[PDB]
Amino acid sequence: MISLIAALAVDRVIGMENAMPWNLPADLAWFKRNTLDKPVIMGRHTWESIGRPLPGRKNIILSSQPGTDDRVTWVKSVDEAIAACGDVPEIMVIGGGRVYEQFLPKAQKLYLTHIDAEVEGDTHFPDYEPDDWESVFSEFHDADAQNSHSYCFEILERR
Ligand SMILES: Nc1nc(=O)c2nc(CNc3ccc(C(=O)N[C@@H](CCC(=O)O)C(=O)O)cc3)cnc2[nH]1
Ligand SMILES: [Ca+2]
Ligand SMILES: [Cl-]
Ligand SMILES: [Cl-]
Ligand SMILES: [Cl-]
Prior knowledge:
An 8-stranded mixed beta sheet has the order 5-4-3-6-1-7-10-9, sandwiched between helices. Strands 2-8 form a two-stranded antiparallel ribbon. The chain has helices at residues 25-35, 44-50, 78-84, 97-103; strands at residues 2-8, 13-15, 40-43, 59-62, 73-75, 91-93, 109-115, 123-124, 133-141, 151-158. The protein has a single domain (1-159), classed as Dihydrofolate Reductase, subunit A, CATH 3.40.430. 20% of the residues lie in helices and 31% in strands. The site of one chloride ion has 2 residues, from strand 9.
């Protein structure tokens, strides 16, 4: 099964010209909880944003240009990315925009963090149809001493 995991500001904003203007360690802990010991597929801009390989996960970079880091796996097609995951119960697609757009039709599950932030977006999560998805988990949190915005965790399963 292929799953997508993303953090969405209002209007499904996922990326901006520069780093996103929030500080959400609790969302990064949720990201880690749901990706640990699973292969993760990402695009090159997300790879640069993270800075280093994500620990405890097989890091696969989908890109048309050859790779510039030996600590991860570089693939050039969606099918090569999936084959590089081997035989695993769940593949995690972690963005960004174009990578979400390519993997959404194959995905059966979405892990979404909805962030109460009004920002002008550079890239957006795909306009999925909520009629077509079933929320099986939702958990709301206010901003606090460590987290700058209110956020809601959601898991959605393809109806
Ligand atoms: N829910 C969600 N939130 C995100 O911030 C997110 N970010 C990306 C792309 N960007 C990033 C940026 C940083 C890290 C990261 O550093 N994660 C660490 C935990 C952070 C920490 O320990 O300080 C990890 O080990 O997973 C992951 C993805 C893709 N899907 C997401 N999904
Ligand atoms: Ca429900
Ligand atoms: Cl968590
Ligand atoms: Cl990307
Ligand atoms: Cl629902």
